[PDB]
């Protein structure tokens, strides 16, 4: 193609899957080359349009290879733009949140990898998580599970100090009574991980939330197991 923003935008908007598979990597090279893409933030309007095209069209593609490649292009953008990507986070998040529950595990996993990278280079964990809480109520059980997993992954990447956990825990608690057993496991797991990073405070928070006692029993027993194993992180 051409090393120009209108050329790249056009290759992002065009909807031929074969051509997308062919130029995804060229788009990556363009954004990761400061000379070829020196004009990147000259026109904020078509920068916005390009991110938007990736999020709405590539990420939502029915071809999972297009989804993964689109996520990769986004990833190159984050590396190139750093904190200036913060302006784009809101635009990309709904489709990334959805794709935490995609049919393909490879997509769920790269999606998490990208999300973590956005938290690391475009903003911070809490700015992104303030905007992801909607995912807890997503109708696809694989997305609710994905949110809990992504929270675990976040604790390990950045530590509990970077999250306002008191904001997030109520949502997980809601997930404890999920119709889906995998979502319920994932939520219990999330609470166990939080406890590993934070300790007894979580047990107090949880006890004051009017959960059924059956639920409290399962979780607290698991907390006790963590203590027994000296598996605390902190």
Measured CA to CA, the distance from residue 95 to residue 58 in angstroms comes to: 10
Which residue in 149, 216, 161, 137 sits closest to 187, CA to CA?
149
Residue 103, exposed/middle/buried by CB under 10 A (0-12, 13-18, 19+)?
Answer: exposed
Q: Give the number of residues written for the chain.
A: 234
Which residue in 50, 138, 52, 132 sits closest to 91, CA to CA?
52
Residue 74, exposed/middle/buried by CB under 10 A (0-12, 13-18, 19+)?
Answer: buried
Q: Is there a contact between 147 and 136 (Cβ–Cβ < 8 Å)? A: yes
Residue 101, C-beta contacts closer than 8 angstroms, at least 6 positions apart: 108, 138, 140, 141, 142, 143, 144, 145, 146
Residue 124, C-beta contacts closer than 8 angstroms, at least 6 positions apart: 162
Measured CA to CA, the distance from residue 70 to residue 55 in angstroms comes to: 8
Question: What does the DSSP assignment read for 7-27?
Answer: HHHHHHH---HHHHHHHHHHH
Measured CA to CA, the distance from residue 211 to residue 78 in angstroms comes to: 40
Method: X-ray
Residue 111, C-beta contacts closer than 8 angstroms, at least 6 positions apart: 71, 96, 99, 100, 102, 146
Q: Strand, helix or coil at 50?
A: helix
Measured CA to CA, the distance from residue 13 to residue 54 in angstroms comes to: 8
First to last CA, the chain: 51
Given resolution (angstroms): 2.1
Query: How would you label 110-125 residue by residue, b for 16+ Cβ within 10 Å and e otherwise?
Result: bbbebbbbbbebbbeb
Residue 57, C-beta contacts closer than 8 angstroms, at least 6 positions apart: 12, 13, 15, 70
Measured CA to CA, the distance from residue 80 to residue 92 in angstroms comes to: 16
Taking CA atoms, 66 is separated from 22, 24, 224, in Å, by 10, 8, 45
Q: Is there a contact between 158 and 126 (Cβ–Cβ < 8 Å)? A: no
Q: Is there a contact between 114 and 75 (Cβ–Cβ < 8 Å)? A: yes
- Angle (CA) 68-124-167 rounded to 5° is 105
- CB atoms under 10 Å from CB of 202, counted, come to 22
Token pair for residue 12?
Answer: 């992002």
Token pair for residue 47?
Answer: 């920068």
- What values do phi and psi take at 207, rounded to 5? -65, -30
């Amino acid at each position: 193609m051409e090393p120009r923003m209108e050329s790249c935008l056009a290759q992002v908007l065009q909807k031929d899957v074969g051509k997308r598979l062919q130029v995804g990597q060229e788009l990556i090279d363009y954004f990761s080359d400061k000379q070829k893409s020196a004009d990147l933030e000259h026109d904020q309007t078509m920068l916005d349009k390009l991110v938007d095209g990736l999020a709405t069209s590539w990420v939502n593609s029915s071809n999972y290879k297009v989804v993964l490649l689109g996520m990769d292009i986004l990833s190159a953008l984050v590396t190139r733009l750093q904190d200036r990507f913060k302006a784009q986070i809101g635009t990309v998040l709904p489709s990334l949140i959805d794709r935490l529950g995609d049919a393909k595990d490879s997509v769920r996993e790269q999606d998490q990898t990208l999300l973590l990278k956005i938290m690391d280079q475009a903003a911070n964990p809490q700015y992104v998580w303030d905007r992801m809480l909607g995912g807890f109520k997503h109708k696809n059980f694989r997305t609710r599970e994905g949110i809990c997993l992504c929270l675990i992954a976040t604790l390990n990447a950045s530590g509990a100090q970077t999250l306002t956990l008191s904001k997030i825990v109520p949502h997980i608690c809601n997930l404890l009574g999920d119709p889906n057993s995998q979502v319920r496991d994932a939520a219990i797991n999330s609470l166990v991980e939080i406890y590993r990073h934070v300790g007894e405070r979580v047990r107090a928070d949880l006890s004051k939330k009017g959960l059924p006692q059956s639920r409290l029993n399962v979780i607290f027993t698991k907390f006790d197991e963590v203590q027994k194993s000296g598996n605390m992180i902190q």
